[PDB]
Amino acid sequence: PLELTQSRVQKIWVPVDHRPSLPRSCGPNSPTVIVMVGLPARGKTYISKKLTRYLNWIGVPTKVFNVGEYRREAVKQYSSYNFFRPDNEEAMKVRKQCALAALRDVKSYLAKEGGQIAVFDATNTTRERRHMILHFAKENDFKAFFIESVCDDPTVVASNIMEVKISSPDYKDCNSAEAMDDFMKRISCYEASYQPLDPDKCDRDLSLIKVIDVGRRFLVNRVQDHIQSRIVYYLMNIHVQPRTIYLCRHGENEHNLQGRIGGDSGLSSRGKKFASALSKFVEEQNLKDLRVWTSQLKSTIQTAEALRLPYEQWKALNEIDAGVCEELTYEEIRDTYPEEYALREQDKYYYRYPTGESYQDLVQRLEPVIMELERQENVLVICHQAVLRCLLAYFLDKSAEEMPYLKCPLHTVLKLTPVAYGCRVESIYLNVESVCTHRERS
Amino acid sequence: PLELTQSRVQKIWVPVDHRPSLPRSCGPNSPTVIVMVGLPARGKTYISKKLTRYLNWIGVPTKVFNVGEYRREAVKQYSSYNFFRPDNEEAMKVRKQCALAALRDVKSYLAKEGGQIAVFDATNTTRERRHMILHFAKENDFKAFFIESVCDDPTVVASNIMEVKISSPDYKDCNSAEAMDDFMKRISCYEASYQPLDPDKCDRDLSLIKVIDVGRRFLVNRVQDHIQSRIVYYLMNIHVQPRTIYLCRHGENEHNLQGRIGGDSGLSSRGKKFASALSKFVEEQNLKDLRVWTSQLKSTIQTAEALRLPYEQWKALNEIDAGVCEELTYEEIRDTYPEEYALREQDKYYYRYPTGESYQDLVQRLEPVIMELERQENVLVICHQAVLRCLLAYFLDKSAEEMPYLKCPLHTVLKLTPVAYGCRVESIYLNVESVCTHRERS
Ligand SMILES: O=c1[nH]cnc2c1c(-c1ccc(Cl)cc1)cn2-c1ccccc1
Numbered sequence A, B: 001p002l003e004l005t006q007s008r009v010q011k012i013w014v015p016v017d018h019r020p021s022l023p024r025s026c027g028p029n030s031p032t033v034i035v036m037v038g039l040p041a042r043g044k045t046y047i048s049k050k051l052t053r054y055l056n057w058i059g060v061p062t063k064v065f066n067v068g069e070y071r072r073e074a075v076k077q078y079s080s081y082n083f084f085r086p087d088n089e090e091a092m093k094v095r096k097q098c099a100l101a102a103l104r105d106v107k108s109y110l111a112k113e114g115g116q117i118a119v120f121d122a123t124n125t126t127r128e129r130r131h132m133i134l135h136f137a138k139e140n141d142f143k144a145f146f147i148e149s150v151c152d153d154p155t156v157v158a159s160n161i162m163e164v165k166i167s168s169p170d171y172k173d174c175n176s177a178e179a180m181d182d183f184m185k186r187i188s189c190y191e192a193s194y195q196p197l198d199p200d201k202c203d204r205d206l207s208l209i210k211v212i213d214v215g216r217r218f219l220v221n222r223v224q225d226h227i228q229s230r231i232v233y234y235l236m237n238i239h240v241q242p243r244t245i246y247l248c249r250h251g252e253n254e255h256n257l258q259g260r261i262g263g264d265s266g267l268s269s270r271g272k273k274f275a276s277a278l279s280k281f282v283e284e285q286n287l288k289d290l291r292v293w294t295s296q297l298k299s300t301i302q303t304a305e306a307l308r309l310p311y312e313q314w315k316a317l318n319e320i321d322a323g324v325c326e327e328l329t330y331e332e333i334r335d336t337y338p339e340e341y342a343l344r345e346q347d348k349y350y351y352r353y354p355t356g357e358s359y360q361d362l363v364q365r366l367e368p369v370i371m372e373l374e375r376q377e378n379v380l381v382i383c384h385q386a387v388l389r390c391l392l393a394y395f396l397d398k399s400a401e402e403m404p405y406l407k408c409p410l411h412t413v414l415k416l417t418p419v420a421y422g423c424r425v426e427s428i429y430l431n432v433e434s435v436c437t438h439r440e441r442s
């Protein structure tokens, strides 16, 4: 009775599966359609992309279905705002067909591809369009959650057009002035039929969030579940204010020199040289304010000590726990635990060290770090190889499969600048020698 | 250069403090005054108490300053709603003095007692009163965050009067009908001067949350920092729907029999008997729906396996990590690590095991568990001794000092029923023998 076995890769206790002669599968909670609402240049695509990046990173399979991309596919080349005219009978039919084709792909993603969240990125400015999306959701047993972005500031609208609209494939043959002018006319095509969400009377029973004036204010109505609550929390923590995220590892430590994993060793002579080089680098950046974050492990704290700046220690930033393999070299791991060594090499993201962690566990631990990084402005995170790969995979939208192999060398600062729909990444090697701890897949 | 030392109790790396002949202290971010807003019987005290319980448990020193308690102290016995009349010149002076005395204690708590959050629990229904609180906050360099509870449902108002108002010390000599009638008249005294928060025009620059219709809808304006964002997230996850929380440990394991700590041992013969007894108990509770949560450790999973109910494994529910002391008996800990043994006995909450955890680390790990427990209805959590003490300290509002000593015996279900401003706790021993793992302070 109650016989369990521990799965070799993830180390999960499962009931001993003495399946009968005819083993049965029973494969595989309700998926969600996130409905973007609002006029063009309201940051709907920005919200869609960023939210999808966060949801995928935390392990919720998410995909964006942008109706404009279906339109660029159906219609050869973009001519002008005339395509978006309410009196353009033909283009209105094409645009409806594109929205229906995107919804068809939403159904296939959620019901047949193991997707959990589909972000329907369109204007969805009319009650008619939204009623149709609701009908589609109800008939397919999908939940519907509306995210409306409301902003009437012309400075914000002009900034969005300049930052990411003029550079759109639609405006390839256009100069900045013509593209901006055409886009303003394009916005005007949607203004007459636009019916904002009304949670007070009409949309009282809908699950929604109204993001007002670039996240200055929020109207939240009927949050049904865990995932909607998480989305709301995320939207309330992110901002579009300019800032820089600097990510680096502690300076080279004594375990690095011996080729040993984990432990709590101190900086080597080179590691101390990096720490001084980092102080000079930080000083040269001339940042008004800078928050410095470290792990609770000695090597990151010693590195921060060289900066002569206040810093905060996070236990969540501590290197991946290697369990029984802590303080061992990779050669000693292969010779003492050959089965464990091979299992990790085959499934590096999901592999859990015995009495230790996986990269998957790291993500769960680092979620509060990410949420706080979003809230903050200029931040320097002094951490460890596996922790750094996880954070970098979040900022650079890298998959779980690529994450354990991202290059994060010692004595090198990764300068992240948020621009358009992601991060510009600059690498700055601080000219101090160290050992190489990067190991490619085999 | 960069010399650090590890603190004996918490195991935190600190700069080697070679203080000069004259060591200097420099003792000790801006505190927050949470302003409750709304008519009586709107759950302001419920919000105040619950939020304070959560904030203290996560490690943010928080205290409630209820103006009504200052009034019960200044005015001998309560007579009737006549005391609350707007034309009652004398009582209006007394009530103002009570609010000012509470604010005086708010200043002393935040500026001189190391308090981080002061919850000002009063009606604060007029712009005049709120302007005065803002002036008080600005002059003392305190942040102000407003929490308004808006509800016009008479069923909700009557329920609040019946649940917690009629049982108030004010209505000691009154029967349920007279107390209810007096309280309705008391509410009416505040209705004429009530000016709700207006984030649209008047209160546009104030940091606030409007909780509408018992958390059905929210208006969030200008969330300035981390703590306000956390409060908003918490308020959006809690509910007042009836439910039961059952908490228990895994059935007795092999390590329990050997007096060994940590590890991942399986159920003993008695532990398996408890698991069967738990299934019978669960069945007898006749719960429409029940969510079952376990840790990722074998003993809790084997216990859940006996229920024949779907369950979810949480790594956050895994027992406290004893680091180097894992799988050792307490006798072996005292003999191999006597310094460590004595340090723990002296400071059980903050003590961190070498390469392991503290009860303080457990709280940080269990925060997502608590947030999900709040969202849910009927939940059974099968966990471990230290994890259980932490969760119980949250529900029962126990301090960090009492937390490591809470009695959580094996083969015993703790049935938690939310009622009034906290939890009713029922203990159910499932009549299966086990060893005793409880150790009192020495
Ligand atoms: O509300 C907007 N209106 C116009 N533009 C916008 C936004 C937001 C935004 C919306 C909601 C939230 Cl919680 C945060 C940011 C981002 N952006 C944006 C700006 C420049 C480039 C790309 C996107």
Ligand SMILES: O=c1[nH]cnc2c1c(-c1ccc(Cl)cc1)cn2-c1ccccc1
Binding pocket: B041, B042, B043, B044, B046, B047, B149, B150, B151, B156, B157, B159, B160, B163, B164, B211, B213, B214, B215, B235, B236, B238, B239, B240, B420, B421
């Ligand atoms: O909004 C209310 N109006 C009247 N009463 C109320 C509430 C809330 C409440 C308010 C906000 C939130 Cl996020 C959750 C619950 C709780 N209570 C309550 C009910 C019975 C006894 C004690 C308290």
Ligand SMILES: O=P(O)(O)OC[C@H]1O[C@](O)(CO)[C@@H](O)[C@@H]1O
Binding pocket: A260, A261, A262, A263, A319, A320, A322, A384, A385, A386, A404, A437, A439
């Ligand atoms: O996932 P990988 O490639 O083993 O890298 C993580 C390892 O790297 C180290 O930071 C040492 O370089 C160890 O602490 C950790 O076990």
Ligand SMILES: O=P(O)(O)OC[C@H]1O[C@](O)(CO)[C@@H](O)[C@@H]1O
Binding pocket: B260, B261, B262, B263, B319, B320, B322, B384, B385, B386, B404, B437, B439
């Ligand atoms: O804090 P205390 O009293 O040592 O209790 C926690 C210990 O109890 C155990 O659950 C064993 O009873 C251990 O796993 C853990 O180390």
